[PDB]
């Protein structure tokens with residue numbers, strides 16, 4: 039037997055359904071999503087950290103001249119200044135008043151703390167969805183991780199279940215993300231080899247331990263102060279620190295649908311968007327006979343009280359006279375009510391209590407028990423709390439909240455609108471016939 | 479200055495261009511794609527090898543009975559055969575004619591050679607195009623690897639180059655691929671937990687070193703032969719061996735566009751499909767005035783000998799009277815002829831030889847020397863050989879193969895037909911005017 043359903047993607051809320059064969063005992067199915075994970079495929083672009091301007095010692099040549107060598111270091115600047123008179127603690131370092139040269143070098147490398155304080159730039163695409171499910175089909179239970187691609191099956195006790203694909207391709211991450219301090223930022227970082235001074239990614243390394251290091255920090259060299267041995271430089275401040283000074287809240291606080299953003303692996307959790315289409319394949323062996331299950335006779339539904347709150351605010355009692363005791367499946371085929379439980383113990387004679395949640399002011403729902411179908415009615419009242427802390431446990435309709443009062447003052451006005459028109463047409467036809475009969 | 483162009487995605491064939499500023503010297507561009515890679519993103523979900531049916535030694539009980547241990551191993555199953563009379567080498571094992579029970583159980587493991595002789599199943603999507611480009615602008619050259627995404631820039635001598643994205647999204651790998659022995663197959667394998675006996679993936683392991691193994695081989699235990707201690711079993715022949723027997727040629731032999739599929743990483747190299755858009759950002763310091771480059775005047779092109787073969791069949795010469803010697807660029811702006819080189823040495827006076835490849839019988843091509851522009855004309859002969867081992871070095875138009883005789887015949891038939899129509903219309907108008915004039 040092939041069954042199909044569509045469970046909304048909402049973690050922590052059970053989904054109970056029933057499989058009714060033509061002449062066999064109903065089969066209860068329950069799916070409880072404990073966690074739904076959306077894991078994008080991220081590849082590392084580069085890693086950024088604070089830079090250190092490691093600068094070589096000034097080489098001073100007295101009474102002579104020097105030349106500069108490249109030395110091939112990241113963003114290295116080498117310059118020779120002519121006319122220096124350096125001073126040490128011991129006195130004048132050089133014995134020529136002029137024509138003394140001082141060559142100074144200044145390069146940049148990753149800071150000593152880049153092994154811990156760094157931000158990784160990722161590119162995200164083709165997100166994959168996984169879901170932790172507690173499944174119960176015909177008393178056969180399982181707790182498993184199912185990939186929400188529509189094709190990967192999870193199988194147990196001969197029953198196969200294929201979940202997904204998710205109805206939406208929406209993902210909280212853009213094409214470029216920045217992970218820093220275990221917290222994902224939705225940033226449009228510069229490409230490798232295209233960083234700019236004073237902004238994120240001014241220095242870029244392909245990997246934390248990679249030897250290569252692109253560096254564009256606008257480093258220049260200034261003339262040393264007279265009578266001083268040092269390498270003066272003026273470069274734009276660190277782009278990593280500037281980015282951290284103003285980076286906006288992360289996706290933990292800005293992602294739509296209330297997604298929870300986690301790292302290692304970069305994933306989103308409990309995104310309340312879309313629905314997962316479930317496909318069950320139940321072998322014919324699991325469908326038992328009708329006589330084995332209890333058969334219900336002379337059952338009626340009484341709605342003790344109904345309050346259309348988010349949680350299970352409605353309660354009903356079914357007066358039943360069953361053929362025998364045992365487990366019995368209960369369901370509501372309509373979408374006007376959702377039962378808390380998909381099964382109930384049943385005796386030979388008595389009353390069964392059923393908890394349900396609804397959004398109707400006046401419920402008219404066709405409850406189903408072991409085999410019979412009992413219509414359950416009543417009225418509901420508004421709940422006593424304005425704001426709650428749990429999501430809605432049911433689904434509403436556009437005509438759910440229209441009470442009998444609204445129906446009366448909508449039908450009387452619209453019906454009365456038509457009645458007067460019909461009266462007018464009838465009078466017009468009658469007088470027209472009378473006029474034609476007046477013609478001699 | 480920003481220059482946007484396109485380049486055919488054909489490895490080996492050099493692409494030559496000239497950028498022309500308003501009053502500055504023309505600047506040459508030469509891009510040689512040595513190798514183009516198309517690398518899909520692959521996720522490994524399982525591996526498959528030959529299985530080994532392990533069997534526990536039978537547990538024999540004389541005048542007794544035994545019970546089956548619960549199954550805990552891949553495809554493991556147990557059976558207790560009653561009424562056995564085992565018969566070892568040292569006579570009968572049991573002194574008990576009947577009520578002797580032999581427990582025989584079997585299961586499936588990976589073969590001892592699964593570390594080397596295994597095929598791994600991948601899911602491929604979102605191919606990432608890469609290229610190896612040797613680029614030359616303004617006598618400055620660089621050989622590098624360019625990611626053909628439309629954003630990653632390559633920097634050299636202050637010049638930005640951005641290649642891509644590829645004009646087509648075609649990839650040779652299907653959604654599901656299989657890698658075995660360095661060869662890639664487009665196989666729609668069953669996914670993990672859905673392997674079938676006797677076919678590829680009958681036994682599945684998430685990784686090579688993973689301790690999990692899904693086995694489905696129709697392992698069935700049979701009753702032992704009388705007086706024999708052994709575990710007789712029956713199962714479908716290994717699906718990996720069956721797949722190896724008839725798996726069809728790998729992608730290396732069946733891929734369109736002449737792709738070369740390699741492994742580690744799984745990639746397709748040198749596919750003759752699509753075109754690569756190129757964008758150069760050239761700093762204005764590279765452009766030099768026309769005075770610096772050797773200006774040229776009083777030049778003409780004579781076509782020495784033209785044959786419209788795939789290679790550089792045509793040879794021409796230009797008689798030049800240059801102001802001074804030096805480098806000077808040459809290029810055909812149109813697509814009716816592709817030059818062999820992009821620069822030539824010019825003396826004070828003389829003649830310079832040019833090699834070009836053309837596809838038209840009569841090449842009327844508007845050659846562009848670095849300063850003077852010469853229209854070069856002639857006739858071509860067909861090549862001698864029917865088949866060559868080189869690809870086509872030129873681009874042909876729909877009207878390039880039409881000879882002068884065909885043009886005369888078409889402009890005769892069409893054209894003269896319209897002239898005959900025009901004569902008839904003129905005669906009709908003239909006689910209509912004549913008959914209207916004769917009203918009186």
Ligand SMILES: *[C@@H]1O[C@H](CO)[C@@H](O)[C@H](O)[C@H]1NC(C)=O
Pocket residue numbers: 070072172181
């Ligand atoms: C399903 O299993 C999860 C995890 O063990 C548990 O939190 C949840 O209450 C279970 N649900 C049912 C209906 O057993």
Ligand SMILES: *[C@@H]1O[C@H](CO)[C@@H](O)[C@H](O)[C@H]1NC(C)=O
Pocket residue numbers: 492508510512612621
């Ligand atoms: C570019 O470099 C490659 C590798 O060194 C070489 O094979 C090729 O001929 C070069 N192209 C040009 C135009 O020099």
